[PDB]
Swiss-Prot record, chain A:
All ranges on the Cytoplasmic side of the membrane: 1-312
Mod. after translation: Glycosylated.
Assembly information from the UniProt record: V-ATPase is a heteromultimeric enzyme composed of a peripheral catalytic V1 complex (components A to H) attached to an integral membrane V0 proton pore complex (components: a, c, c', c'', d, e, f and VOA1).
Organism whose genome encodes this protein: Saccharomyces cerevisiae (strain ATCC 204508 / S288c)
Superkingdom: Eukaryota
Subcellular location: Vacuole membrane
Name the UniProt record assigns to this protein: V-type proton ATPase subunit a, vacuolar isoform
Family: Belongs to the V-ATPase 116 kDa subunit family.
Function: Subunit of the V0 complex of vacuolar(H+)-ATPase (V-ATPase), a multisubunit enzyme composed of a peripheral complex (V1) that hydrolyzes ATP and a membrane integral complex (V0) that translocates protons. V-ATPase is responsible for acidifying and maintaining the pH of intracellular compartments. Is present only in vacuolar V-ATPase complexes; enzymes containing this subunit have a 4-fold higher ratio of proton transport to ATP hydrolysis than complexes containing the Golgi/endosomal isoform and undergo reversible dissociation of V1 and V0 in response to glucose depletion.
Other remarks in the entry: Present with 55714 molecules/cell in log phase SD medium.
Coiled coil: 104-132
Curated annotation (Swiss-Prot), chain B:
Protein name stated in the entry: V-type proton ATPase subunit C
Family as reported in the entry's similarity comment: Belongs to the V-ATPase C subunit family.
Miscellaneous comment text of the record: Present with 21114 molecules/cell in log phase SD medium.
Location of this chain's protein in the cell: Vacuole membrane
Species in which this protein is naturally found: Saccharomyces cerevisiae (strain ATCC 204508 / S288c)
Subunit structure: V-ATPase is a heteromultimeric enzyme composed of a peripheral catalytic V1 complex (components A to H) attached to an integral membrane V0 proton pore complex (components: a, c, c', c'', d, e, f and VOA1). Interacts directly with VMA4.
Function: Subunit of the V1 complex of vacuolar(H+)-ATPase (V-ATPase), a multisubunit enzyme composed of a peripheral complex (V1) that hydrolyzes ATP and a membrane integral complex (V0) that translocates protons. V-ATPase is responsible for acidifying and maintaining the pH of intracellular compartments. Subunit C is necessary for the assembly of the catalytic sector of the enzyme and is likely to have a specific function in its catalytic activity. Reversibly leaves the enzyme after glucose depletion, causing the catalytic subcomplex V1 to detach from the V0 section.
Length: 312, 56
């Protein structure tokens, strides 16, 4: 049958024993935190407890990102339908369960950072596509650096008004101001090539994206052809990421839950054993008993008010 | 002074441009508010033609 483990103080030893008794538990022997090697204090268990809290953390990290809600379910027994299936009758193999969860956390962090890097780059280039298009076409000089244009997006035509007054007072009428309503507002100021920095200060201070060229893909002539090919690479690269995100969501949502319930039982196993010194001077008794295999289920369901179990 | 400032604003302001033209006419010398006092420096309002008011 399965070896079973109990812990208490010696105050309710008798009241616990009686109740243990009634569930067909056999060969109940009271022991101490020393005699069985597993149930002996080690620094090793203080680390092991930490490895389980790192798994717990990981579950939260993963659950947030996938957009799959918080899981509570809280089993450690085989009586329950999901408790039996998602928590194995055999004891813990700590090295393994950590090793499954560690890798996935790592692969997940790399993916997520990359997804974020792709998403901002794509949304900006698709936006400045149109802008550069307008400003170049408005030509035969703005495929070079002969005339200066300042393309830019602004989200208030009101603040643009304020900039026209400023520009005019201190920088004269060297601006030609054109505007189109976009999906933002496309503003354009057009200027000399030796006052370039002076207009920029003003633009910066009221917050606009007035740059002389708003994309860095430039390197084919005209600029817009490179920008369009880069944006074809961007668009599919986010998609591919999503496909990867999905594959990982299908494999591990159920698994996540099954680890979560496992871990509950492992936090319990280290406390039982006495995981550290605090635990020792709080629960001086650790007891031994044998529970038949079918019965093993109703036993871990039982949790007294101080008693927690591990079965093998 | 109040009458002077207004007549020049009305008359010449059009040359500077319609965008440039704001109404916040009037003058508060007490510290109850800091609106109503022209200067090109502030974004709050602007002079609409080259005009400086000199107070000795």
């Amino acid at each position: 049958m399965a070896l079973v483990q109990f812990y208490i103080p010696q105050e309710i030893s008798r009241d616990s024993a009686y109740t243990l008794g009634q569930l067909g538990l056999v060969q109940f022997r009271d022991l101490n935190s020393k005699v069985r090697a597993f149930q002996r204090t080690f620094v090793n268990e203080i680390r092991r407890l930490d490895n389980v809290e790192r798994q717990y953390r990981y579950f939260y990290s993963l659950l947030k990102k996938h957009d799959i809600k918080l899981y509570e379910g809280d089993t450690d027994k085989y009586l329950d339908g999901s408790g039996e299936l998602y928590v194995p009758p055999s004891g813990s193999v700590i090295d393994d369960y950590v090793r499954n969860a560690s890798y996935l956390e790592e692969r997940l962090i790399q993916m997520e950072d990359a997804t974020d890097q792709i998403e901002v780059q794509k949304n900006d280039l698709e936006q400045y596509r149109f802008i550069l298009q307008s400003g170049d076409e408005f030509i035969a000089a703005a495929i070079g650096a002969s005339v200066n244009y300042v393309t830019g997006v602004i989200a208030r035509d009101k603040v643009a008004t304020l900039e026209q007054i400023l520009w005019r007072v201190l920088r004269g009428n060297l601006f030609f101001k054109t505007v189109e309503i976009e999906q933002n507002a496309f503003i354009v100021f057009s200027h000399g090539d030796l006052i370039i920095k002076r207009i920029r200060k003003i633009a910066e201070s009221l917050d606009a994206n007035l740059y002389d060229v708003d994309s860095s893909n430039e390197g084919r002539s005209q600029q817009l052809a490179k920008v369009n090919k880069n944006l074809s690479d961007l668009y599919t690269v986010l998609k591919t990421t999503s496909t990867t995100l999905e594959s990982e969501l299908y494999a591990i949502a159920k698994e996540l839950d099954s680890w979560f319930q496992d871990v509950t039982r492992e936090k319990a196993i280290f406390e039982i054993l006495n995981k550290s010194n605090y635990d020792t001077n709080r629960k001086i008794l650790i007891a031994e008993g044998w529970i038949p295999r079918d019965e093993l289920a109703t036993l871990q369901a039982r949790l007294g008010e101080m008693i927690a179990r591990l079965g093998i | 002074l109040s009458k002077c400032k207004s007549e020049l604003i009305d008359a010449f302001g059009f040359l500077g441009g319609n965008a440039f033209m704001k109404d916040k006419k009037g003058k508060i010398n007490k510290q109850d508010t800091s609106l109503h006092q022209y200067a090109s420096l502030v974004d709050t309002e602007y002079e609409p033609f080259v005009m400086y008011i000199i107070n000795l």
